A paper describes a structure:
Nevertheless, the tri-Asp site in LarE represents an unusual metal binding site that selectively and stoichiometrically binds certain multivalent cations. In the apoprotein structure the tri-Asp site is pre-formed to receive a metal ion by a hydrogen bond network consisting of Asp231, Arg228, Gly207, and several water molecules filling the site. Notably, the arginine residues form a positively charged ring around the tri-Asp site, limiting the metal-Asp interactions along the three-fold symmetry axis and likely responsible for only one metal ion being captured by these residues. We observed binding to the tri-Asp site for Ca2+, Mn2+, both Fe2+ and Fe3+, Co2+, Ni2+, Cu2+, Zn2+, and Cd2+, whereas Mg2+, K+, Cr3+, Cu+ and Cs+ did not bind at that location (data not shown).
In all cases, the Asp231 side chains bind the metals with bidentate coordination, with a seventh site always showing extra density that we modelled as a water molecule. Nevertheless, the best interpretation of electron density is always a seven-coordinated metal atom consistent across all observed elements. For small molecule complexes in the Cambridge Structural Database (CSD) the most common and second most frequent coordination numbers for Mn2+, Fe2+/3+, Co2+, Ni2+, Zn2+, and Cd2+ are 6 and 4; while for Ca2+ they are 6 and 7; and for Cu2+ they are 5 and 635. The results show a similar picture for these elements with the most frequent coordination number being 6 for Mn, Fe, Co, and Ni; 7 (closely followed by 6) for Ca; and 4 for Cu, Zn, and Cd (with 6 coordination being less frequently observed). Interestingly, when carboxyl groups are involved in chelating Zn2+ or Cd2+ in protein structures, 7 coordination (as observed in LarE) is actually the most frequently observed coordination. Several metal soaks (Co, Ni, Zn, and Cd) also resulted in binding of these metals to surface exposed residues. These partially disordered sites only appeared after metal soaks, showing a significant electron density peak and in some cases anomalous peaks. In most cases the surface site involved only a single histidine residue. This resulted in higher B-factors of these metals compared to the tri-Asp site. We reason that the tri-Asp site captures low levels of contaminating metal ions, most likely Ni, Co, or Cd, from the Superdex 200 resin used for other protein purifications in the laboratory.
Residue numbers in the entry:
A (entry chain E): 2 to 126, 144 to 259
B (entry chain D): 2 to 125, 144 to 259
C (entry chain F): 2 to 126, 138 to 260
D (entry chain C): 2 to 126, 136 to 259
E (entry chain A): 2 to 125, 134 to 171, 176 to 259
F (entry chain B): 2 to 127, 141 to 259
The structure:
Amino acid sequence: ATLATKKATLVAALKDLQRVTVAFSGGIDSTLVLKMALDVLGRDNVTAVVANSELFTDEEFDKAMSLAEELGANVQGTTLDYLSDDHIKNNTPDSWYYAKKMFYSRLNDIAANNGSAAVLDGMIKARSLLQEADFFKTDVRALAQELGLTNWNKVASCSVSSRFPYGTTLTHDNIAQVMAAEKYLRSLGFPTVRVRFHNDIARIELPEARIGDFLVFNDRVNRQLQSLGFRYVTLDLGGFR
Amino acid sequence: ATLATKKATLVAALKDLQRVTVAFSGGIDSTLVLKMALDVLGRDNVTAVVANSELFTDEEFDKAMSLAEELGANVQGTTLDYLSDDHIKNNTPDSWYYAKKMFYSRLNDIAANNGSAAVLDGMIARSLLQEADFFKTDVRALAQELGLTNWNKVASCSVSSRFPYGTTLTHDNIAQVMAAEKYLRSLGFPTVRVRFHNDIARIELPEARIGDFLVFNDRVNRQLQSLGFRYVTLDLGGFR
Amino acid sequence: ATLATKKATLVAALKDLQRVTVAFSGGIDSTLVLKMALDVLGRDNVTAVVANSELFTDEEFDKAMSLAEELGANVQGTTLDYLSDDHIKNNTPDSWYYAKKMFYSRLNDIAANNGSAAVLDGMIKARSEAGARSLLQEADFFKTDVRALAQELGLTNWNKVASCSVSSRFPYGTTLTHDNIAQVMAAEKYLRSLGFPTVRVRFHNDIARIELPEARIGDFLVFNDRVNRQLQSLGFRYVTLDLGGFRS
Amino acid sequence: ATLATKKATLVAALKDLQRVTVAFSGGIDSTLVLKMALDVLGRDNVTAVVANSELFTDEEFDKAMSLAEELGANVQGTTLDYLSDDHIKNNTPDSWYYAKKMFYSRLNDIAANNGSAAVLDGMIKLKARSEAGARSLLQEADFFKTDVRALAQELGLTNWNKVASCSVSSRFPYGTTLTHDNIAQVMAAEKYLRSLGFPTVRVRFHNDIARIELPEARIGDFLVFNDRVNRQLQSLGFRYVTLDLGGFR
Amino acid sequence: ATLATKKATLVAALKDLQRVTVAFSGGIDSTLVLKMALDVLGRDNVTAVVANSELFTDEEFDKAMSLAEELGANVQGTTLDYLSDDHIKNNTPDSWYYAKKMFYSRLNDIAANNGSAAVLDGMIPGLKARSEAGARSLLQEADFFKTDVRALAQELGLTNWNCSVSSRFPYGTTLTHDNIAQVMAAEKYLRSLGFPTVRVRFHNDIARIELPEARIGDFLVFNDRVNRQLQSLGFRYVTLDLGGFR
Amino acid sequence: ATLATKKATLVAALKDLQRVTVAFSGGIDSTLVLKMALDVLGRDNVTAVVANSELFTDEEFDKAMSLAEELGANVQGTTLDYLSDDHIKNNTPDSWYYAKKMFYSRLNDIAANNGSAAVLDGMIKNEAGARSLLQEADFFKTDVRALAQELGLTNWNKVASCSVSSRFPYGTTLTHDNIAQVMAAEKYLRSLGFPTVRVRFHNDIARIELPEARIGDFLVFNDRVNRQLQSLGFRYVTLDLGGFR
């Protein structure tokens, strides 16, 4: 289809819902949904909710809260303690299962309190309207460009649980350790980076085309990540993913 | 804290001034102010001013003069002789102050003489984008809304910072430093300083670009030597 | 002299033509012509045409078609077989000319069959021989006038990077075939997917001569072996990197 | 004393022994002992023995066998199963002692079966050697490292192992149990890395993690090989293949 | 059996020929043959010959000539025009054979004119190039392995010892005096920048540089100088093989 | 001439001198001279002299003293005060001349007092109180380690010592402090794996010259070298884009 046909399904789907609460993370997808809902449904009939968790950075939470205000939405912060579930706290392979299970249960209850007909997320190809309207990665960038949206989270980052091996118990300490390492690495000019936690070993994942540029920082990163508690600081030769 | 609320603040403030003179550098901030001023006050009530100076590049001047005309403004070039002032010519730690005073005094005289209510600049003189609480994100959202895509993106700094305190700035050693930085930028290094130390050139690059730079060592060495440096070096501390 | 007089010359030229066919590449210039043509003459009186050929990417074609639909134009792709012309098939130094004569004759025939008064291209200040109009050139548009009017019409999206014919990857006198062209484009596509958007894979039979911007060559080294084996499996015997860098 | 007096002490000790078996590693010290032994007692009365084990690389074994023959000695390889001793298999700080103990007793049996009066090693100015009865003639004659370099030049000796081979056990943390499998894993990984042009390298074993140590001044050169090293070491059984940012130690 | 029995066959064979001409390259193999012949037959009955050709560098020749003088042989250079033979000039896959045929014919012509009983080399499309010449490889007849030659080189006290440029050209490409000088100048320039192991493969207007992969990072600082130098030697395009040397 | 004849000229020339004093730096040329002198005249009539000075490192001096003993020589250290001469102290373009005059004048006094017939150095092909026997016998660089390998010689200083004067511009006054500064910087750089290096002194700027083929390898050390040379007193630490020499 044309982008206009997919955009029309999205307006038509939204009018049919009349009042929605939209799970807003700040990535390009959720920024498109949040804006489309505000444009078809009005400020007072769309609720943006930003999840606060121990698994995400305060900066990503703060950036989404600020773009939702910048977009003109009533946005509400709700804080989730993902670590209360021992399936998640011990990061067993089902651990995504309960994390999504907790995210949507908080989101479903919020919709009852402001009278929305459904809560929307930003999944592409709970209702995920961009997938129902058959939006692909190229379609989402095209519509956002047409809607004048310029600011969104270019740092498509993930819950910090993905840095830990299955069976490792998450702690306030080792999560902060992983996140302080990634924040330090990003401050040197590597916006895409993972610091995988392996007890005494830190395993750094960088995009392969950035590894040559990284070499000037080896010693400072080595000494900095050792001061955060790692005994050995290493670079994955496989790169990011 | 909506963009629509800040844009109304900026429109309202511009309506209260009626006739404005805009300090126009050509960056996104000053280009946003110049269009907003044209859209609410009209061509005949806005004067765009572009400083022609020895401390900034002719490329920055030519691009700004053309971008003001392209946006639909009446544009005026004014030329500042910063080196006639001995505080700037001798590069003291206070020279920035005298340079800013000479610049804002010329802009005040133009605005007084064309009947403007204020001089405007792009800071985030009135800085209305700062008064309306525009952030870098707000400014990119409004420029897209006005259909503005074209502006200079090479961040501009006075060439004074390339010289040690106590150094006498001259037309020749300024031209030397600027030809060197223009050459380096043309190789693909948009953020670069050639600090001047008489017979030594001290190059600052972002540390993450120094590996990429090595394929050019010999050409940079020979080019900056032909520009008058005897030794061409790379600071191991990098940019800053 | 002023933009407003230049915009009026263009409006008048379009009103006089009443019905037009637009050669649409997706760049800023043809995007401005198509937008003005749609605003002045209406959707049913404008046909946007995007050429599909073996000498350009299927990506480039898909994006140009999508840019014309996004503007609100009825757009039709036409398919050109440039290799049927022996100046192009044998990559003579004048082959660009025969490619454009063939392109403009197809556009003239499309215009004849839908009732347009002219074919419009986006040239500014072999088309003289087919009768294409460059209304921006006639109205004295320079690059800054195009950027000014596009911003006053709210146009922000277009192709920022011009397309070059894959003919430029082959030495003069080399015979282009559906097979070796597919080789050059698959090699360049693989390279772009590793993070090198500006690249050329020059064809010298058993040798691929890769052109990269010199500032990226340090970044490229982590890929030497994968590029070597990938381009060999595409049919090259030797995979090399030009020491002069991109366009030397 | 003088180099000449020390050289005469060494000559005298060898003539009194008549027939010797020489523990030959290829380093400068055992190379001096073997050369002196051949110069004083002749090819027919000297047996050079080179230990082959799974704790040292096959490349070093072949190089020592060739350095011994090139010097003119009858040279014999013996194979040691160091993992048969559990003091060695359990990677304790005294495991080196039991490895030397097993090596010196095999040399004693070889010495008994070829009629030698002593086993000679190349030690200069400790308890496994002395328990076994091996003699260190350079130490008895009071050779220091400079004396060994002096007499080596006098005899025209130029070729020897500059690299000192270390046991693969140092790639494993203390208390990690050595196995035929994890040793072969570490040794094949290092062998591939050396074959790319990196003679000084360690692959430290961390179960599913391989931690590569290279001299920092070579890490820039290594970049062209990351992807092949990753897949090669993954095919050897490591899940993760990493480069230590600290370099070689 | 033992090394002493293997060198014993070589003593006997050398004693029976009395006067020999020795094809001398300077590698470990030919230096042992030349030293054995001098020790068994004496200086006045041994002629060492070193081939000088356009397909090798004047340094390879100069190093080989000294090697034989230091061994104690009377040494003689002969110069061959390998490009006169069209198997070699057109770089067919067998031209190594025809180069050795021309070499052994010149050496047989040298040996007949000084009266040697045979031509000796250091070895361990038609008839084998030696057998067709009559050349003996005495180290091969004595069943020498690479260890025996390294062993025997030390029992006689040997201390000093040591590729055709055709391998820079594709099969079917015509060798000329000029493109040979071009390739040889290009490799000398690269070696002088610190790359002792290097090949400049000639592909007409394209130079394809082969380097050990572990040196390509070090090479980048030289790209532009190498590009312009090899262009000035006559190449239009100067490239680096991503597969590296070998 | 053949290498064997050049060796005979050297043997004959050494036998005609009977007792020699050898200027010994530890490089290949002077170790070849020192070895030939011992092999032809015997230890008791060869005196090896190693100059200790502020313009060369203590590390090269100790290595040279120990290499002479390893060669079989009686070795004697002598101390030179190069900075006592004002051409050297003020780094005039003349200073090489006064440094060589002071070096050879000291060696001649040692030679006179131990009864040697000549002072020997290791100069080759391509002072008047010095014989360079390798030069008289027409030895080239190829001849020297052809012959050095025939004597089995392996240990010698493989990177060339140069006077620290070349790290300072002509006209700069050399002092104990700025020499110590340059010498601690080059020693640090060598300790990271860069045996061939110059730290050129330009007051508050250090200009590091490295062989161009090593500059890619050096990037992993930029920050450590920057901080180390700053702690030695340099304000700016830079890398010459032209590389070494």
